Each structure stands twice: as structure tokens, then as C-alpha cells.
Amino acid sequence: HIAIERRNMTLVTLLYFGELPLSLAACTNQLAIVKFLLQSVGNTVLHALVEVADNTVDNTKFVTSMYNEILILGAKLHPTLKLEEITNRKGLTPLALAASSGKIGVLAYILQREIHEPECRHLSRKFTEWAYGPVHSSLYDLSCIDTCEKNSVLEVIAYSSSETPNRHDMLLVEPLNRLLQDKWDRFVKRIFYFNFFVYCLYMIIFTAAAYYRPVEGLPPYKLKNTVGDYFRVTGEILSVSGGVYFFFRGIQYFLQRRPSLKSLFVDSYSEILFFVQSLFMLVSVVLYFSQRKEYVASMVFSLAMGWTNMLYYTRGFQQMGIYAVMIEKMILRDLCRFMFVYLVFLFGFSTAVVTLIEDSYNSLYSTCLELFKFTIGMGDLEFTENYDFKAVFIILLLAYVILTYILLLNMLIALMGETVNKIAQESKNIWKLQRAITILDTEKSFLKCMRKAFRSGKLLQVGFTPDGKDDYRWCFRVDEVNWTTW
């Protein structure tokens, strides 16, 4: 390993990048050294090379060349023995490890690799079926990447908590995009539209049952034999059954995803929404059967939540999905830090004025609301009059008006603009990540109808393997037109 450090083949022949000398010499980007040498962590040489990638053009070029040479050398050294199917200490394949790690160009290479050498056609991935003019008919296998039961690269990129840096920019490569469109427009689009109208009609039934709730007495109420009463009972039953579903789907989401506490609100914002919505529905029905008139309070929240929580489904549509992602970003970053700062100002001035006034229009609850109104421009500057020192009170409002209305809110608006301006293309692009998420969750819940489906499908035989036995895998055909190539 020490000789590998100095790139010395002499002492090597005499005899953090792992410990095996070949691993360090490969990590030191000395292909001749490992070629001469060959001829705990749990990471193989491929996994080590995946970890070594720095997503820069020179590092990616070196890593891809090293991996191509390693693939050729591995096929020569052992044709029957698996090379890519090996799993690291995490259990991930090296492709999966690179996908998790943040190797955009490396993953693009693995997806799009083709072998000029025919004997290197054993491990090649990209294939070309024909080329009439400038239009070539290409073929990508992508057999394991879509639907391997252990792990799938699509899954790994999907369940990425933004810690992977270019985790969004990964799937921009042609097979992932193309396959994503295929799955969507094949069946995921239609079932998501069915999802949309089921939930929309759910929210309408929940709204009608809520609006025409019965009031007389304290709950529960006797179910009188009447057409209206029968309708309201049936509507309540359908509503609470929907509620317990959006509990169960949500809780299995948390269980199967196992999200961290910090990643919770910064990735699964829609999920927490549809969890809290069902949670309020459950608390409402509990209080409805616990002999309390407060149930409707809980009920109201879920109802309000639910319609505002409908906006996820516009995350479906493209032109609306960007627009949804804006609201996600602002409720996560800006209107939390800003809302704390405005709480600092609000609390400071409200305690100031309440200490200034002596007598009960002055209470800190009422005074904060009264000072809150100024920000929306509905504040009445006249306020109260029982207080002494009119100048010392008025300077406090004028300070609060200059500060929190003009200085602070406007500044916040500028900060938001700084958000929309950077994310106009960015969130545009992000939309297709949530597109992919929904596409995967479709296979998720519909396990029975997705494995049989074989949405990727198109099993085309790879041919003669390095072992030399005829074998078949799954493929998918593309068209690439390049007049510049001729």
C-alpha cells in the first residue's frame, strides 16, 4: 500500500482509500500500476471507485476510464464470476452506491456505456439496433435498474433526502427520463387521475357532511329515520373511512421510508400534511364519541387542511407543479425564519405598549392581534385611549410601522423574490423529481399490479455473455437523431 502511495511499481513487484495496495493504486489513478500488479469497509474496488468520484470533469473522466479498464480486466480475469452484481457493506450495488453517493456523470456513464472493443461487448450497456440516416435506433438494457427486488437505482434516487448533492440531476440521463415517461403515460397517469378524482370527491363529501352537520344536542346524535339524516350518517361514515386510510397509508410511508427527524419536514412535506389531516379527522371523531362539542373544532382543521392539501395533486400537472414547489420552499425556509423574527418584533413592541398602558382592551393577546393588523394594513392607528403619555405610545407604533411593515415585510418580499428568481428553472426541473416519486409510489402501493405489469418490459436477449452462455435480460428501445454525426 505504501508503494501504491508513491506510485512505485518496483517495491510493489517486490512485495483514505482502503487498505489493499491495488485499491490505493487504483484510487491514486495509476492504471498501469494496477495492471502490472494484477497481471471491514465492505466496499469492493468498484465501490471504492464510486466513492472516489468527485463529480468534476477530470475526476469523472479518470474514474470512468479506470472503471472501463477494470471491467475489461475483470472480464478477462474471470468471465463467469460476477463483477457488478457484488454488494457493498450497505448491500448496495456499485451502481446503487454511486447513485446514493452523488456521482452524476459516473451514473450517466454506467447507463450510457458502449464498448468499441467487441470482446468488451460482454459488459456493455448501451446498444444500437440500426441507423437509417442520422437517426439511430438505440437500445438500453436497464434490466436490473428498474425493478430488482433487492434495490433499484430509480428507488435509491427517489428516496434521497437532498443530502446527495446532484440527487435531482441524476435521472436527467436519457433512459431514466424515457422510462419515467413510459411508466407515467402507460398506466401511472390514468391511475393518478383516478387518485385525483377519488380524493377530490372525498373532499367534496367531507365538505358537504361538514357544512350540513347537525347541531341539536351533544354528540353523538340519534340516527332518525329520515332522508337527510340517512345522508348525513352515510357521509360521516365515508369521511371517517377516508380519514383512517390517510392515516394508514401515511404511517406505512413513515415505516417503509424510515425518515430521519431532520429530513422529515424538509423532504416529505406533503406526507406530513396528509398525515396531520387524517390525524385531525381521528381526533375529531374521538371527541365526537367522547361526548364533547369541541369535535367540530378538530374537524374544521382537517377540512381546511384537506382543501389546501389538495394542492399536492397540482404537483401532478407540469405548469402547476412548479407553482406548488414554490409554496413548499417558502413554508419551509423563508416564512419560518421570517416568522420567528417577526415574532421577536411583535413580542417586543406588544410588551412595550402593554407596559405603557395602565387601566381591558390592553391584554397581550389582544395587543399582539392589534399590532398584527398593522402588517396587513388593517390596523387602526387610533388604537385605544385609556393610556397616558400619548407621544410615548405613538412613537412606539410609528416605530413598529416603519420597522415591521415597511422595513421588514418588504425586505422579506425581496427575500422571497430572491427565491422565485433562482427557482424559476430549478423548481421547474424539480417537478419531474416529484413526477418520479409519484410514479414509484404507484408501483409501491399497487404491488400486485406492478410486478406483473413489467412497465419497463421489452426483454431483449443480451446474447453471448463473457461466460459464453446465451442469456437474456430486459431492454428498452430509443431513437436518437444527430445530423451533426451523419
Ligand X SMILES: CCCCCCCC/C=C\CCCCCCCC(=O)O[C@H](COC(=O)CCCCCCCCCCCCCCC)COP(=O)(O)OCCN
Binding residues for ligand X (CB under 6 A): 365-366, 368-369, 372, 390-391, 394-395, 398
327 contacts 416 by C-beta, under 8 angstroms: no
Sign of the alpha-carbon dihedral angle for 45, 48, 50, 55:
negative
Q: Which does 368 bind (CB under 5 to 8 A by kind): ligand X, a second copy, none?
A: ligand X
Nearest C-alpha neighbor of 170 from the set 182, 155, 181: 155
- The footprint of a second copy on residues 361-380 (CB under 8 A) is 364, 369, 372-380
Could you give the CA distance from residue 80 to residue 86 in angstroms, rounded to a whole number?
13
Residue type, 438: T
Local structure of 478: helix, strand or coil: strand
> CA angle at residue 149 from 147 to 152, to 5 degrees?
50
Q: Is 284 among the annotated ligand-binding positions?
A: no
Pick the stretch among 37-45, 310-318, 443-451, 460-468 that binds a second copy (CB under 8 A): 310-318
Q: CA 58 to CA 269: how far, in whole Å?
A: 37
CB of 92 to a second copy, least distance (A): 23
For residue 281, how far is the Cα from the chain centroid?
A: 26
Cβ 1 to ligand X shortest distance, Å: 60
Secondary structure of residue 139 in the 3-state scheme: strand
Q: Does the annotation place 377 within a ligand binding site?
A: yes
The listed partner (ligand X, a second copy, none) that binds 59, CB under 5 to 8 Å by sort, is: a second copy
Any contact of residue 417 with a second copy (CB under 8 A)? yes
270 among the known binding-site residues? Answer: yes
Judged by CB under 8 A, does residue 406 bind a second copy? yes
Q: What's the CA gap between 125 and 68, in Å, rounded?
A: 12
What gap in Å lies between CA 386 and CA 393, rounded to an integer?
11
Select the residue interacting with a second copy from 17, 196, 247, 269 (CB under 8 A). Answer: 17
**5 contact choice in a second copy, ligand X, none (CB below 5 to 8 Å, kind-dependent):** a second copy
CA distance 315 to 438: 10
- Cell numbers describing residue 417: 423574490
Pick from ligand X, a second copy, none: which does 414 bind, CB < 5 to 8 A by kind? a second copy
State the cell numbers at 468: 459464453
Interface residue with a second copy among 132, 149, 258, 469 (CB under 8 A) is: 132
Exposure of 240 in the CB half-sphere (CA atoms within 13 A): 15
Read off the C-alpha cell for 80: 463467469
- Compose the 167-206 pattern: x for residues touching a second copy by CB under 8 A, - for all others: ----------------------------------------
Q: Choose the contact partner of 41 out of ligand X, a second copy, none; CB within 5 to 8 A by kind.
A: none
Q: Which does 323 bind (CB under 5 to 8 A by kind): a second copy, ligand X, none?
A: a second copy
Q: What is each CA distance from 306 to 62, 239, 296, 310, 474, in whole angstroms?
A: 51, 12, 15, 6, 42
When asked if residue 11 is in the footprint of a second copy (CB under 8 A), the reply is no
Which partner in a second copy, ligand X, none is near 390 (CB below 5 to 8 A by kind)?
ligand X
Which of 106/346 has CB closer to ligand X? Answer: 346
Q: In the complex, what is the shortest distance from the CB of residue 61 to a second copy, in angstroms, rounded to a whole number? A: 11
Binding to a second copy, residues 330-349 (CB under 8 A)? 330-331, 335, 337-339, 341, 344-345, 347-349
Q: Most distant CA pair in the chain: distance in Å?
A: 97
Residue environment code for 228-241, b if the CB has 16+ CB neighbours within 10 A, otherwise e: eeeebeebbeebbe
* Rounded least distance, CB 298 to a second copy, Å: 9
The option from ligand X, a second copy, none interacting with 386 (CB < 5 to 8 A, set by class) reads none
Q: Within a 13 Å sphere around the CA of 21, how many CA atoms are in the beta-carbon half?
A: 20
Judged by CB under 8 A, which stretch of 71-79, 157-165, 248-256, 307-315 contacts a second copy? 307-315
* 403 is a site residue for a second copy (CB under 8 A): yes
Smallest gap from Cβ 5 to a second copy, in A, equals 5
We find the least distance from the C-beta atom of residue 256 to a second copy, in angstroms, to be 29
Q: Determine, following the binding rule CB under 8 A, whether residue 140 of this chain makes contact with a second copy.
A: no
Q: Determine the 3-state secondary structure of 45 from DSSP.
A: helix
Residues annotated in the binding site for Na(+), as ranges?
377
